[PDB]
Every structure is written in structure tokens, then in C-alpha cells.
Design a protein around this ligand. Structure first.
Ligand SMILES: O=C(O)[C@H]1O[C@@H](O)[C@H](O)[C@@H](O)[C@@H]1O
Ligand SMILES: O=C(O)[C@H]1O[C@H](O)[C@H](O)[C@@H](O)[C@@H]1O
Ligand SMILES: [Ca+2]
Ligand SMILES: [Ca+2]
Length: 129
């Protein structure tokens, strides 16, 4: 089952805001990226039992188009312009899973816009791959 970390709480936001306009989110809301570039969500407390490759499953909404995010783990960029494809509606919450290396113990993960803005981001769920 893993751990789910909400996007809206327990994070640091840059040019991004907590929003509740579209229904279906988990927790208290979701995050809306505001800037086409350099908007960010940083999770500061991703807590793993083991070091290894993780499945990081983003729950997100994206009415149309593809939007690409840079993905950092423990301060190092590890995915460049990773695509988030459309869900069809701002209240259609889809899932996208990436496979990235993380350490045991406490880690950080930061996702950043790069020129196409971002999906509305609900949470991430991290499991061992
Ligand atoms: O070590 C791991 O990968 C897993 O550790 C578990 O305890 C966490 O609940 C899960 O989120 C991590 O993916
Ligand atoms: O296209 C976007 O990024 C934005 O479009 C609308 O403003 C929508 O209400 C937002 O939730 C979304 O973030
Ligand atoms: Ca937005
Ligand atoms: Ca949420």
C-alpha cells in the first residue's frame, strides 16, 4: 500500500497555491501551479524503510494537453521534462507512475514547471518497486 503524501500540506509551494475548486481530491485540496516555468511543489518528508527504486504515483487532473515537469530527488534533478498527459477534465483525477531511486529514511522530492505549466496535483503515493 505504501504512503500517500498530500500535495497541499506538508509541502513547500513556489508560485503555486492550494485550490478546492474542482471536486474529487483527497485530503483538504490540491495544488494549482501558477507559473509556466519555475512553479514547484517540494515534499520535505518522504519516509522510506529501504533504499531502492520506488514507484511514485501522482494523482492529478489536466483538462487538455500535455504538461511537463522536472523531477528532483534529494536535490538532484533525476527526470527532465517528464510528461503528464491529459485526463480530459479538471475533475477527472488520473494517475501517473514514475520509477525513481530513493534512499531509506527521510528524502525530499520536488516537481517543477519548465515552460508548459503543470497539472493540478492532488497527492503522491510512494511504494517500493
Ligand atoms: O521502503 C519503501 O520503499 C517503503 O517504505 C514503506 O514503509 C513506506 O510506507 C513506503 O511509502 C515506502 O515506499
Ligand atoms: O490551466 C490551468 O493551469 C488552470 O486552468 C483553470 O484556471 C483551472 O481553473 C485551474 O485549476 C488550472 O490550474
Ligand atoms: Ca495552473
Ligand atoms: Ca490532496
Amino acid at each position: 500500500t505504501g504512503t500517500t503524501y498530500e500535495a497541499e500540506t506538508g509541502t513547500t509551494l513556489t508560485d503555486a497555491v492550494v485550490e478546492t475548486l474542482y471536486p474529487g481530491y483527497t485530503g483538504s485540496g490540491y495544488v494549482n501551479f501558477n507559473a509556466y516555468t519555475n512553479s514547484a511543489i517540494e515534499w520535505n518528508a518522504i519516509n522510506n524503510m529501504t533504499t531502492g527504486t520506488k514507484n511514485v504515483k501522482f494523482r492529478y487532473a489536466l483538462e487538455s494537453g500535455t504538461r511537463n515537469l522536472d523531477i528532483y530527488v534529494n536535490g538532484t534533478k533525476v527526470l527532465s521534462n517528464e510528461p503528464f498527459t491529459e485526463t480530459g477534465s479538471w475533475s477527472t483525477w488520473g494517475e501517473k507512475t514514475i520509477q525513481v531511486a530513493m534512499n531509506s529514511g527521510v528524502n525530499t522530492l520536488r516537481i517543477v514547471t519548465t515552460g508548459t505549466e503543470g497539472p493540478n496535483m492532488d497527492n503522491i503515493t510512494v511504494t517500493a518497486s
